[PDB]
Ligand binder design. Sequence first.
Ligand SMILES: Nc1ncnc2c1ncn2[C@@H]1O[C@H](COP(=O)(O)O)[C@@H](O)[C@H]1OP(=O)(O)O
Length: 213
Amino acid sequence: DFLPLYFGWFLTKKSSETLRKAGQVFLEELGNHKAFKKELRHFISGDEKLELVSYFGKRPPGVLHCTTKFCDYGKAAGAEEYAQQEVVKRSYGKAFKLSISALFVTPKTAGAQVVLTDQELQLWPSDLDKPSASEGLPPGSRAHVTLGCAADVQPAQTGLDLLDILQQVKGGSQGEAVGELPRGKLYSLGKGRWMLSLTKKMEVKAIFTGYYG
Ligand SMILES: Nc1ncnc2c1ncn2[C@@H]1O[C@H](COP(=O)(O)O)[C@@H](O)[C@H]1OP(=O)(O)O
């Protein structure tokens, strides 16, 4: 039995649509915000204003998801080990609620930050080789829903972008709200990194299962 392309929490139609809409609204608001317009030179090398919805042109089609373990049908290291865990097998097909704490944007990716519960964290892989960007941060910090990518950006970048943002927030808690959007306060972590910290945690319903391409 070969494995999925990856395991993860696949948002329901309703949840996906709601989160997708919130993301689109955020990109729109952020692109119209003066704090962002002034900092456009740290975001692109090209010279007006930038519609971020077109900037993040590569978007997931259909239902949004929060990936746990990328398996590539068993070719990814640790894939077999992850899939054979009892909690994975037991949780397969089960419904969960994911807590979205923030939306974020970088020159590469737009996404939503997922804060996993302890129960859900048991489904988070503990692999042998880690990205060093996760050092000193709690397990599962990388948890995210990808909303969009710049044209030449590759997958798994959104997870990396998020960790880079979070290891800015831990060291400095960096920003007083440069703006106050209606869903929360807006942070500018420099270098084209933006974060909307939601006053209000968004809850999305999802199913833990495997995607097979
Ligand atoms: N090396 C990888 N490591 C972790 N996740 C990956 C990797 N490659 C692809 N993915 C993740 O699997 C999902 C589908 O990827 P793909 O479209 O290439 O098949 C995406 O959520 C992507 O994460 P991400 O959302 O951060 O890009």
